[PDB]
Amino acid sequence: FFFTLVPSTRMALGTLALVLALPCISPYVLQLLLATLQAALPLAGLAGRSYLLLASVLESLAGACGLWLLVVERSQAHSPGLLLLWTVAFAAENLALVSWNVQFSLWVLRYVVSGGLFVLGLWADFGRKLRLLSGYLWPRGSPALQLVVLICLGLMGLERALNVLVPIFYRNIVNLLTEKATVTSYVFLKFLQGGGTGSTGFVSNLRTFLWIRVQQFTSRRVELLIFSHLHELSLRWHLGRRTGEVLRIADRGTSSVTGLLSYLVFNVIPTLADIIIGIIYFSMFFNAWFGLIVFLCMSLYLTLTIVVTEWRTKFRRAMNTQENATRARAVDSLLNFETVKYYNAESYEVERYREAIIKYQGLEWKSSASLVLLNQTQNLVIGLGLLAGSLLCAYFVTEQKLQVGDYVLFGTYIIQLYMPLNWFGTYYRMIQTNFIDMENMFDLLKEETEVKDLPGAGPLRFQKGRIEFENVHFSYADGRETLQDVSFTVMPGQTLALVGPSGAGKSTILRLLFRFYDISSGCIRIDGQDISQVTQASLRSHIGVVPQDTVLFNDTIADNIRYGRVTAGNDEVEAAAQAAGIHDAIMAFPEGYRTQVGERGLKLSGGEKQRVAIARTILKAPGIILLDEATSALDTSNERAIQASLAKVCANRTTIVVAHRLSTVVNADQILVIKDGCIVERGRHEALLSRGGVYADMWQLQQG
Amino acid sequence: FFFTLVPSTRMALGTLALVLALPCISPYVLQLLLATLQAALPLAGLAGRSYLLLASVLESLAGACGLWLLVVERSQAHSPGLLLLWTVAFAAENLALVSWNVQFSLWVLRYVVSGGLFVLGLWADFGRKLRLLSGYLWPRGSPALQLVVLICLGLMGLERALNVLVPIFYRNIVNLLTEKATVTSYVFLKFLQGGGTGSTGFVSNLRTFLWIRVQQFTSRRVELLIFSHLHELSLRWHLGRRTGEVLRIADRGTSSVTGLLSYLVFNVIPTLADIIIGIIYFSMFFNAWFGLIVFLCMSLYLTLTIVVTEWRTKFRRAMNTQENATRARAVDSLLNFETVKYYNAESYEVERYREAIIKYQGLEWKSSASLVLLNQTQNLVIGLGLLAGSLLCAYFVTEQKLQVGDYVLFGTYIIQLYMPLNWFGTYYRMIQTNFIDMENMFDLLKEETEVKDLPGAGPLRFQKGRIEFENVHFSYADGRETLQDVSFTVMPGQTLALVGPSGAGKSTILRLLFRFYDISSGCIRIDGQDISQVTQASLRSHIGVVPQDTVLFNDTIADNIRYGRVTAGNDEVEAAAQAAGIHDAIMAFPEGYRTQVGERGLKLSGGEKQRVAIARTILKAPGIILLDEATSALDTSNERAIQASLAKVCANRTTIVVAHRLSTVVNADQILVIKDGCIVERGRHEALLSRGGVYADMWQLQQG
């Protein structure tokens, strides 16, 4: 009787008013008809009208009006289907009326049940490893995710507890079936069966659902750590490595961390804890040889799965090598179609390719048959363990020395213990692959620098822009002298122009002004102070180097300009684009001031790429200028335009230029050619032409 | 009593004499000690010595001597460990002696058991689809594999029979547990439990083991069929396609056929047959609403798994697109390390890359949470179906209107029915991928030719080698005239040399002598008969064309020479190598006469590659010669050597040469230049020099 009112209260409590707050013609009239029928049913209940009747009428009145509001709010433009389904599910009390075979309530219930049906129808060392990983499970200094880690370990402790405790309740169910040979207490056991067996995979899903956010934070932390640490400078270590393997080992390391911690806390610790707690549960059930023979079963299954996966891996390697060989022979016979047609190997090459197919497919049969013998001897000893355990329990129940009828517990319990063991055994090759993915990343975490930030690293006192060199040296190898004993002092507002030999000594000198490399001896100073005692970022924040190339990331053009200095608004972007003059290219381009460029976006011409580069350096606004002028010259409008923009960025600036062109070198303050690790001549253009040094030879080279 | 003798007979029958035939110091002395102890045990049994005693002594004598033979045969240089293990396993009868707590037998058994323990220790439209696939399950005309297909369908019918029938025997086991509340008949049920539950995965492994050889024959048949059919000639269809996609669609089609027939006969037909036979088993058990609610369970699980895999696939596509975008931005920020260091984006690019990582990882959380909601609502309605079914069976057993105690059958049977349903539901995307892999292959099976073998295709009456052209035309497109109205008759033992324009008209003319292409009109005949009425292979078996390039397959050099004609022995290979003169290169190469060459083997120089090509054509031995002389000339020793080998293969032969060199054209019978689809001049070298045609212009071009 009260169960119907409780079910009505539970149905009426489907967050009707609560959700209605939270979520904020013929079909609308059909809903208004249901709301009219619900108002009529509630007015019929009020007309029929004790506290249950008044509470029913109150629930009916609120639910009915909520239907009108829900329908009207959809007109002002899922959950109603859930409400109607939950209500129609609660209407299964009807059978309790039929069980009788007062009246006004039956008519009201019959009218309600029809009105709901209408609503639903209308709605339609390993110590170092463990210490480092226990540190790797610690996010940060914030109290909102350590609590979630506590939830994860709490459900992890709950899962094996329920996983061992609910087959005992199944045993209680069948035992009480024998002892009643009661329905109410049997239903109070069956509810534990329902909410227990509908909870194993459910609690595994909740575990993995919070494990997702655990992996989110850990992957963020390790990926940003290694991405910061691969942005240190060791260029000889850099350039021999391609970018693809360098970031592939990083992705393998973060998925190594993910798979490693998730599997070692999800399928290694819990299955060993499950086996241990099963044997100890038997040790509090009955201390006998049963735990020993079941322990023999699980250990034997583990050992055979490991050793036949070790049998599997060599067959997989041989099968991979044979399929690579046959597909290579196939495509390389297909490559020269014309000589395959020139000879009458039309019926021969199919025979030799079929021979290679047979030679691969035999090893394919061997590998798949090894899988067959794995699963075969596996299920054979599983059947033998079930047979031995089931016979010893059968002997026990027919001898009645323990509690009887419990054979279903020991029957399903071996299968339930075994079900994670192959789930482990398929990942023995995987955990060692995770180890070799994480160990190289651990080596990569903490390696080295090439330029070393000495203590006392301070700011760069940008007084005037006066750069002096004093008997300096350099090596990128042993005895490697691309630069040897040069010395100068370049002044503010003046310009050095540099030609070198056919070699990267010019760019190397440009990089050691930048301190992109190191010096073995000598003295390089900027504005009085040595370049090596200071912070690198405060050194290179006052430096603008024009590169000969120009990268274009897959992004838009205002972000590409703000790549010069990211603290800009769009006003300085447009002002720098009008300073360079490349804003008219943005007029010629579609997207306003956000033209998507790069590798897949909108491409560019080479002088315009250098115009985007010089616009980036214009936005960056240093005082120290270092141009890398291309040997690839352009049209004289493009040539004098890039020289005029170089003038507009270089006027009254401390400017240092490497170049091989004419207009740059016919006007500068001093022209230097630096070949074989030394300055080979010094002087202006008129000085080199009046002394006739190697500038005469390179004058013949620029002539032709 | 007799069980011990039967076990002794079964142990003695471990194929001791049978295998010993089939398979054909301190450890040897240890085995001789065991054989001496076994001779002593058998002599003790003969000394103790009725028919069982004489049969035991006979088994002991044969087994003992087999141990001496097995040990000695290993000295004359696994199974002995199996024999000793099977024997020591049979020695578990010992407990039957202990059960007593005659004598000579006990001492003999005690001495035997010790002797075995020593041996073991010492040893250590879909209608068209179904019709075509039912044809695709038919191998050939041989009676040894259709029988295996009958075995496959027999075990397939056996598997569902046992899979439904053995939980009824589990129900019999627990029912007889209740009705004995007998041990011998209960063991005669428990043996069915053992040999039945140790047979489900076992018969699945035997099925898949013979399915392996089924896949072997079907993959051989379909791969060789499509490999023959991709070796037809449609060159405009050929050249636009790369080899990799052409063979990748073939590998996808054969694995499509494999996965398609194996899954549609293994996880679609049997699981539907299992559901149907479960409901019909209930229909012969009790015809009620139980079959309807279980049918509701299985259908609801199927529908939700399908629709949330359809929910899954768009999340997988979006997650793939986002991970491609983030990894592309990451590697393209890493590409220009020097500008990343030139600007102070060292702390900015890590922030923008972390922003992209967050933007991808949110969709990663959404996809993995979609997997969570899949498994969650899955296990939720599985628990609801278990709850409804288990409660209705609980109501039935507490009301006793059926056979009681059967609740374990309906308990495990829903799980056992369900266990293949997700095994199907994970392959809904896979079967449609198999369909799109097989349909294009079906289109590729039967397409077309470009040169059509007309009926009346006969041999090539190789009388003299006289080739005539009569107002001929050609097109590889619409209105495409690289050749238009040329006509000649080249004689036996004489030589035409051909120069063309900067275009492939020369090679195209060379290919239409070969009938590599088709003609729109005209008349091309060889030795009186038209080239188009005949078989292609009998046309191109009397033709040797020197190609400008030379393919080298990943194989050895005698097979590379026998690529000219595969019917050769090694005598003609060596004779042709001495005819060309490239056998001294085989002397310079390591492997005798089998030097492994190709892409991974031993490489070559270009003139020597052409020497291997001309050795192939020398071995092929035609009369019709067609040289494709390279424009890339070599050293004058190499040049006059390849011209001298061309002379040695071309002397008194019907020879046609395309060339651009000098020594070929200063001696030939007639020199033709064919530009813009016409012969532009005719005559010998002295004729072109005495009339001064375009040979004057190309004389200036060869001069410089």
mmCIF file of all heavy atoms in Angstrom, chain A residues 183 194 198 201-202 205 209 212 243 331 334 336 341-343 348 368 372 376 379 383 387 398 408 540 543 551 563-564 566, chain B residues 183 194 198 201-202 205 209 212 243 331 334 336 341-343 345 348 372 376 379 383 387 398 408 540 543 551 563-564 566, unseen atoms left out:
data_model
loop_
_atom_site.group_PDB
_atom_site.id
_atom_site.type_symbol
_atom_site.label_atom_id
_atom_site.label_comp_id
_atom_site.label_asym_id
_atom_site.label_seq_id
_atom_site.Cartn_x
_atom_site.Cartn_y
_atom_site.Cartn_z
ATOM 1 N N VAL A 183 10.647 -15.776 0.860
ATOM 2 C CA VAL A 183 10.692 -15.028 -0.391
ATOM 3 C C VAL A 183 11.080 -13.576 -0.129
ATOM 4 O O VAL A 183 11.784 -12.958 -0.930
ATOM 5 C CB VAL A 183 9.347 -15.166 -1.139
ATOM 6 N N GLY A 194 21.463 -8.118 -7.540
ATOM 7 C CA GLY A 194 21.266 -7.104 -8.556
ATOM 8 C C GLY A 194 22.238 -5.948 -8.456
ATOM 9 O O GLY A 194 22.990 -5.680 -9.397
ATOM 10 N N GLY A 198 25.468 -5.826 -10.889
ATOM 11 C CA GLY A 198 25.369 -4.642 -11.720
ATOM 12 C C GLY A 198 26.303 -3.550 -11.241
ATOM 13 O O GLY A 198 26.030 -2.360 -11.423
ATOM 14 N N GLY A 201 31.550 -4.197 -13.495
ATOM 15 C CA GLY A 201 31.934 -3.391 -14.640
ATOM 16 C C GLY A 201 31.598 -1.926 -14.467
ATOM 17 O O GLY A 201 32.306 -1.066 -14.986
ATOM 18 N N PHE A 202 30.556 -1.628 -13.690
ATOM 19 C CA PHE A 202 30.169 -0.249 -13.412
ATOM 20 C C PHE A 202 31.231 0.479 -12.588
ATOM 21 O O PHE A 202 31.604 1.619 -12.904
ATOM 22 C CB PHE A 202 28.801 -0.264 -12.722
ATOM 23 N N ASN A 205 34.210 1.088 -14.792
ATOM 24 C CA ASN A 205 34.008 2.246 -15.653
ATOM 25 C C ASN A 205 34.181 3.551 -14.895
ATOM 26 O O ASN A 205 34.746 4.504 -15.437
ATOM 27 C CB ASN A 205 32.629 2.187 -16.291
ATOM 28 N N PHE A 209 36.991 6.237 -15.645
ATOM 29 C CA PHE A 209 36.519 7.581 -15.948
ATOM 30 C C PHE A 209 37.281 8.634 -15.153
ATOM 31 O O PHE A 209 37.572 9.716 -15.673
ATOM 32 C CB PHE A 209 35.021 7.686 -15.673
ATOM 33 N N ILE A 212 40.891 8.815 -16.429
ATOM 34 C CA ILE A 212 41.032 9.685 -17.602
ATOM 35 C C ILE A 212 41.618 11.037 -17.209
ATOM 36 O O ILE A 212 42.610 11.485 -17.793
ATOM 37 C CB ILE A 212 39.678 9.855 -18.314
ATOM 38 N N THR A 243 63.453 15.924 -36.748
ATOM 39 C CA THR A 243 62.406 16.327 -35.813
ATOM 40 C C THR A 243 61.445 15.175 -35.526
ATOM 41 O O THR A 243 60.951 15.039 -34.394
ATOM 42 C CB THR A 243 61.681 17.551 -36.391
ATOM 43 N N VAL A 331 56.076 -5.595 -55.333
ATOM 44 C CA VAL A 331 56.048 -4.237 -55.878
ATOM 45 C C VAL A 331 57.250 -3.971 -56.784
ATOM 46 O O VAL A 331 57.141 -3.202 -57.746
ATOM 47 C CB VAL A 331 55.924 -3.175 -54.762
ATOM 48 N N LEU A 334 56.373 -5.379 -59.999
ATOM 49 C CA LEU A 334 55.406 -4.506 -60.650
ATOM 50 C C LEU A 334 56.003 -3.208 -61.162
ATOM 51 O O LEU A 334 55.381 -2.579 -62.020
ATOM 52 C CB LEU A 334 54.254 -4.155 -59.708
ATOM 53 N N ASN A 336 58.691 -2.419 -63.031
ATOM 54 C CA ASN A 336 59.058 -2.410 -64.445
ATOM 55 C C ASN A 336 58.076 -3.273 -65.243
ATOM 56 O O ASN A 336 58.394 -4.378 -65.718
ATOM 57 C CB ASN A 336 60.510 -2.847 -64.612
ATOM 58 N N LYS A 341 56.464 -7.140 -69.538
ATOM 59 C CA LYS A 341 55.782 -7.421 -70.794
ATOM 60 C C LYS A 341 56.756 -7.728 -71.927
ATOM 61 O O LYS A 341 56.390 -8.439 -72.868
ATOM 62 C CB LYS A 341 54.886 -6.244 -71.175
ATOM 63 N N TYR A 342 57.985 -7.198 -71.858
ATOM 64 C CA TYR A 342 58.975 -7.435 -72.907
ATOM 65 C C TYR A 342 59.426 -8.883 -72.914
ATOM 66 O O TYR A 342 59.616 -9.476 -73.983
ATOM 67 C CB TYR A 342 60.186 -6.519 -72.720
ATOM 68 N N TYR A 343 59.607 -9.465 -71.739
ATOM 69 C CA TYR A 343 59.864 -10.892 -71.652
ATOM 70 C C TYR A 343 58.546 -11.635 -71.474
ATOM 71 O O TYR A 343 57.511 -11.042 -71.170
ATOM 72 C CB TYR A 343 60.838 -11.186 -70.514
ATOM 73 N N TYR A 348 55.586 -16.743 -65.599
ATOM 74 C CA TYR A 348 56.660 -17.165 -64.708
ATOM 75 C C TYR A 348 56.665 -16.377 -63.406
ATOM 76 O O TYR A 348 56.881 -16.954 -62.330
ATOM 77 C CB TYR A 348 58.017 -17.021 -65.407
ATOM 78 N N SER A 368 50.131 -18.743 -36.474
ATOM 79 C CA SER A 368 48.745 -18.890 -36.048
ATOM 80 C C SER A 368 48.519 -20.218 -35.335
ATOM 81 O O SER A 368 47.746 -20.276 -34.376
ATOM 82 C CB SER A 368 47.811 -18.744 -37.245
ATOM 83 N N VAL A 372 47.162 -21.140 -31.634
ATOM 84 C CA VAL A 372 46.260 -22.263 -31.363
ATOM 85 C C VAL A 372 46.771 -23.113 -30.205
ATOM 86 O O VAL A 372 46.012 -23.453 -29.296
ATOM 87 C CB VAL A 372 46.041 -23.114 -32.631
ATOM 88 N N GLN A 376 45.104 -23.601 -26.659
ATOM 89 C CA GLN A 376 44.708 -24.989 -26.476
ATOM 90 C C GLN A 376 45.254 -25.558 -25.179
ATOM 91 O O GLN A 376 44.499 -26.122 -24.383
ATOM 92 C CB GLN A 376 45.169 -25.831 -27.661
ATOM 93 N N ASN A 379 43.425 -23.595 -22.257
ATOM 94 C CA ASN A 379 42.102 -24.109 -21.916
ATOM 95 C C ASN A 379 42.151 -25.557 -21.442
ATOM 96 O O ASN A 379 41.288 -25.971 -20.663
ATOM 97 C CB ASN A 379 41.168 -23.977 -23.120
ATOM 98 N N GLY A 383 40.645 -26.494 -17.917
ATOM 99 C CA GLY A 383 39.692 -27.575 -17.731
ATOM 100 C C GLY A 383 40.166 -28.601 -16.720
ATOM 101 O O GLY A 383 39.367 -29.138 -15.954
ATOM 102 N N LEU A 387 38.391 -29.389 -13.288
ATOM 103 C CA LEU A 387 38.049 -30.778 -13.010
ATOM 104 C C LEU A 387 38.551 -31.204 -11.639
ATOM 105 O O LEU A 387 37.801 -31.807 -10.867
ATOM 106 C CB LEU A 387 38.634 -31.676 -14.098
ATOM 107 N N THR A 398 29.567 -34.527 -1.273
ATOM 108 C CA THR A 398 28.970 -35.844 -1.086
ATOM 109 C C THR A 398 29.435 -36.500 0.208
ATOM 110 O O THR A 398 28.839 -37.498 0.628
ATOM 111 C CB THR A 398 29.262 -36.775 -2.268
ATOM 112 N N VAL A 408 28.546 -24.067 -6.872
ATOM 113 C CA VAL A 408 28.474 -22.992 -7.858
ATOM 114 C C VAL A 408 29.486 -21.887 -7.545
ATOM 115 O O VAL A 408 30.050 -21.277 -8.465
ATOM 116 C CB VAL A 408 27.022 -22.475 -7.933
ATOM 117 N N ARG A 540 69.357 38.183 -25.877
ATOM 118 C CA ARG A 540 68.706 38.045 -27.169
ATOM 119 C C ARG A 540 67.355 38.743 -27.235
ATOM 120 O O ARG A 540 66.673 38.641 -28.260
ATOM 121 C CB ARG A 540 68.578 36.559 -27.504
ATOM 122 N N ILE A 543 68.099 42.028 -29.661
ATOM 123 C CA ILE A 543 68.797 41.600 -30.868
ATOM 124 C C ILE A 543 67.763 41.248 -31.928
ATOM 125 O O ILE A 543 66.851 40.456 -31.669
ATOM 126 C CB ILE A 543 69.714 40.391 -30.585
ATOM 127 N N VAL A 551 60.210 30.864 -41.886
ATOM 128 C CA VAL A 551 59.231 29.831 -41.578
ATOM 129 C C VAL A 551 57.840 30.453 -41.582
ATOM 130 O O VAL A 551 57.660 31.629 -41.234
ATOM 131 C CB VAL A 551 59.570 29.149 -40.233
ATOM 132 N N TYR A 563 54.392 36.868 -33.722
ATOM 133 C CA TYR A 563 55.532 36.005 -33.447
ATOM 134 C C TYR A 563 56.823 36.790 -33.218
ATOM 135 O O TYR A 563 57.738 36.272 -32.569
ATOM 136 C CB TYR A 563 55.707 35.014 -34.598
ATOM 137 N N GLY A 564 56.921 38.015 -33.746
ATOM 138 C CA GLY A 564 58.050 38.872 -33.418
ATOM 139 C C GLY A 564 58.091 39.249 -31.949
ATOM 140 O O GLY A 564 59.130 39.139 -31.296
ATOM 141 N N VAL A 566 55.127 38.801 -28.682
ATOM 142 C CA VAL A 566 53.763 38.352 -28.413
ATOM 143 C C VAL A 566 52.981 39.278 -27.500
ATOM 144 O O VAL A 566 51.779 39.064 -27.307
ATOM 145 C CB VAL A 566 53.789 36.939 -27.808
ATOM 146 N N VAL B 183 27.385 -40.918 -5.616
ATOM 147 C CA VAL B 183 28.695 -40.361 -5.930
ATOM 148 C C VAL B 183 29.219 -40.940 -7.242
ATOM 149 O O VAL B 183 29.880 -40.246 -8.017
ATOM 150 C CB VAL B 183 29.663 -40.584 -4.746
ATOM 151 N N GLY B 194 33.684 -32.126 -16.983
ATOM 152 C CA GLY B 194 35.078 -31.987 -17.350
ATOM 153 C C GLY B 194 35.316 -31.983 -18.845
ATOM 154 O O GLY B 194 35.850 -31.013 -19.390
ATOM 155 N N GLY B 198 35.864 -28.472 -20.779
ATOM 156 C CA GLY B 198 37.190 -28.476 -21.364
ATOM 157 C C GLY B 198 37.136 -28.725 -22.857
ATOM 158 O O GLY B 198 38.074 -29.276 -23.440
ATOM 159 N N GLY B 201 36.323 -23.815 -25.733
ATOM 160 C CA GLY B 201 37.462 -23.156 -26.346
ATOM 161 C C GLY B 201 38.335 -24.106 -27.136
ATOM 162 O O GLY B 201 38.938 -23.707 -28.130
ATOM 163 N N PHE B 202 38.364 -25.380 -26.740
ATOM 164 C CA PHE B 202 39.131 -26.394 -27.455
ATOM 165 C C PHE B 202 38.568 -26.645 -28.853
ATOM 166 O O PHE B 202 39.323 -26.702 -29.837
ATOM 167 C CB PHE B 202 39.163 -27.665 -26.599
ATOM 168 N N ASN B 205 39.339 -23.649 -30.983
ATOM 169 C CA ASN B 205 40.711 -23.682 -31.471
ATOM 170 C C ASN B 205 40.880 -24.662 -32.620
ATOM 171 O O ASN B 205 41.608 -24.371 -33.572
ATOM 172 C CB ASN B 205 41.661 -24.033 -30.337
ATOM 173 N N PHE B 209 41.913 -23.656 -36.307
ATOM 174 C CA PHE B 209 43.105 -24.309 -36.833
ATOM 175 C C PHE B 209 42.870 -24.858 -38.233
ATOM 176 O O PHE B 209 43.766 -24.801 -39.082
ATOM 177 C CB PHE B 209 43.551 -25.424 -35.890
ATOM 178 N N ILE B 212 42.486 -21.939 -40.688
ATOM 179 C CA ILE B 212 43.777 -21.432 -41.167
ATOM 180 C C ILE B 212 44.071 -21.939 -42.575
ATOM 181 O O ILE B 212 44.368 -21.150 -43.478
ATOM 182 C CB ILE B 212 44.904 -21.817 -40.192
ATOM 183 N N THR B 243 52.365 2.145 -57.858
ATOM 184 C CA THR B 243 52.345 0.717 -57.559
ATOM 185 C C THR B 243 51.832 0.453 -56.145
ATOM 186 O O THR B 243 51.141 -0.552 -55.908
ATOM 187 C CB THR B 243 53.759 0.155 -57.772
ATOM 188 N N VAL B 331 55.650 19.792 -34.605
ATOM 189 C CA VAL B 331 56.850 19.560 -35.411
ATOM 190 C C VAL B 331 57.185 20.772 -36.282
ATOM 191 O O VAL B 331 58.362 21.031 -36.553
ATOM 192 C CB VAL B 331 56.735 18.266 -36.249
ATOM 193 N N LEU B 334 58.966 23.058 -34.118
ATOM 194 C CA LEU B 334 60.317 22.555 -33.908
ATOM 195 C C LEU B 334 61.217 22.695 -35.122
ATOM 196 O O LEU B 334 62.436 22.643 -34.953
ATOM 197 C CB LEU B 334 60.302 21.082 -33.499
ATOM 198 N N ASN B 336 61.969 25.213 -37.228
ATOM 199 C CA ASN B 336 62.833 26.391 -37.239
ATOM 200 C C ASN B 336 63.268 26.730 -35.809
ATOM 201 O O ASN B 336 62.828 27.719 -35.197
ATOM 202 C CB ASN B 336 62.131 27.549 -37.942
ATOM 203 N N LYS B 341 64.644 30.384 -31.254
ATOM 204 C CA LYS B 341 65.631 30.961 -30.351
ATOM 205 C C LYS B 341 65.876 32.440 -30.629
ATOM 206 O O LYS B 341 66.263 33.175 -29.714
ATOM 207 C CB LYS B 341 66.942 30.184 -30.447
ATOM 208 N N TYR B 342 65.666 32.889 -31.874
ATOM 209 C CA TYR B 342 65.886 34.290 -32.226
ATOM 210 C C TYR B 342 64.861 35.188 -31.558
ATOM 211 O O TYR B 342 65.193 36.285 -31.096
ATOM 212 C CB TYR B 342 65.828 34.480 -33.743
ATOM 213 N N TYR B 343 63.615 34.745 -31.504
ATOM 214 C CA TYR B 343 62.610 35.453 -30.730
ATOM 215 C C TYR B 343 62.553 34.876 -29.322
ATOM 216 O O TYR B 343 63.089 33.803 -29.046
ATOM 217 C CB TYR B 343 61.255 35.378 -31.429
ATOM 218 N N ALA B 345 60.050 33.520 -27.914
ATOM 219 C CA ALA B 345 58.890 32.645 -27.875
ATOM 220 C C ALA B 345 59.190 31.338 -27.161
ATOM 221 O O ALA B 345 58.441 30.368 -27.322
ATOM 222 C CB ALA B 345 58.389 32.372 -29.294
ATOM 223 N N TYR B 348 56.517 31.332 -24.809
ATOM 224 C CA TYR B 348 55.222 31.540 -25.445
ATOM 225 C C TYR B 348 54.764 30.313 -26.221
ATOM 226 O O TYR B 348 53.578 29.956 -26.177
ATOM 227 C CB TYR B 348 55.278 32.754 -26.380
ATOM 228 N N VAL B 372 33.121 5.091 -21.994
ATOM 229 C CA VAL B 372 32.614 4.860 -20.638
ATOM 230 C C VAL B 372 31.093 4.739 -20.632
ATOM 231 O O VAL B 372 30.543 3.819 -20.027
ATOM 232 C CB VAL B 372 33.092 5.965 -19.673
ATOM 233 N N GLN B 376 28.938 1.548 -19.760
ATOM 234 C CA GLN B 376 28.141 1.790 -18.567
ATOM 235 C C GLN B 376 26.676 1.473 -18.803
ATOM 236 O O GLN B 376 26.069 0.728 -18.027
ATOM 237 C CB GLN B 376 28.303 3.235 -18.106
ATOM 238 N N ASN B 379 26.473 -2.448 -19.370
ATOM 239 C CA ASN B 379 26.439 -3.238 -18.143
ATOM 240 C C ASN B 379 25.228 -2.906 -17.278
ATOM 241 O O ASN B 379 24.764 -3.767 -16.525
ATOM 242 C CB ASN B 379 27.730 -3.024 -17.351
ATOM 243 N N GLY B 383 22.760 -5.793 -16.210
ATOM 244 C CA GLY B 383 22.357 -6.014 -14.831
ATOM 245 C C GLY B 383 20.851 -5.981 -14.652
ATOM 246 O O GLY B 383 20.299 -6.744 -13.859
ATOM 247 N N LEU B 387 18.641 -9.029 -13.478
ATOM 248 C CA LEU B 387 17.755 -8.819 -12.341
ATOM 249 C C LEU B 387 16.338 -9.276 -12.655
ATOM 250 O O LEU B 387 15.724 -9.983 -11.853
ATOM 251 C CB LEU B 387 17.768 -7.343 -11.947
ATOM 252 N N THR B 398 10.503 -20.205 -5.896
ATOM 253 C CA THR B 398 9.822 -20.114 -4.610
ATOM 254 C C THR B 398 8.339 -20.440 -4.727
ATOM 255 O O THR B 398 7.682 -20.646 -3.702
ATOM 256 C CB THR B 398 9.996 -18.732 -3.969
ATOM 257 N N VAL B 408 21.046 -21.510 -11.276
ATOM 258 C CA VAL B 408 22.408 -21.344 -11.778
ATOM 259 C C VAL B 408 22.448 -21.440 -13.304
ATOM 260 O O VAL B 408 23.243 -20.743 -13.954
ATOM 261 C CB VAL B 408 23.327 -22.372 -11.086
ATOM 262 N N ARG B 540 55.548 -11.425 -79.170
ATOM 263 C CA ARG B 540 56.632 -10.866 -78.380
ATOM 264 C C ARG B 540 57.613 -11.919 -77.885
ATOM 265 O O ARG B 540 58.543 -11.578 -77.145
ATOM 266 C CB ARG B 540 56.041 -10.071 -77.217
ATOM 267 N N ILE B 543 60.986 -11.246 -80.209
ATOM 268 C CA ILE B 543 61.318 -9.826 -80.194
ATOM 269 C C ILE B 543 62.260 -9.561 -79.029
ATOM 270 O O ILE B 543 61.960 -9.932 -77.889
ATOM 271 C CB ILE B 543 60.049 -8.957 -80.073
ATOM 272 N N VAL B 551 66.088 -2.721 -64.794
ATOM 273 C CA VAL B 551 65.638 -3.062 -63.452
ATOM 274 C C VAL B 551 66.546 -4.148 -62.887
ATOM 275 O O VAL B 551 67.063 -4.999 -63.623
ATOM 276 C CB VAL B 551 64.151 -3.484 -63.472
ATOM 277 N N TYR B 563 66.103 -14.318 -66.231
ATOM 278 C CA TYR B 563 64.958 -13.461 -66.502
ATOM 279 C C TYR B 563 64.761 -13.196 -67.995
ATOM 280 O O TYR B 563 63.643 -12.876 -68.409
ATOM 281 C CB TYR B 563 65.121 -12.144 -65.744
ATOM 282 N N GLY B 564 65.822 -13.308 -68.802
ATOM 283 C CA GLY B 564 65.661 -13.237 -70.247
ATOM 284 C C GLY B 564 64.828 -14.379 -70.799
ATOM 285 O O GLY B 564 63.898 -14.165 -71.580
ATOM 286 N N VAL B 566 63.394 -18.161 -68.982
ATOM 287 C CA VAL B 566 63.465 -18.954 -67.758
ATOM 288 C C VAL B 566 63.668 -20.438 -67.998
ATOM 289 O O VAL B 566 63.868 -21.186 -67.033
ATOM 290 C CB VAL B 566 62.191 -18.740 -66.923
#
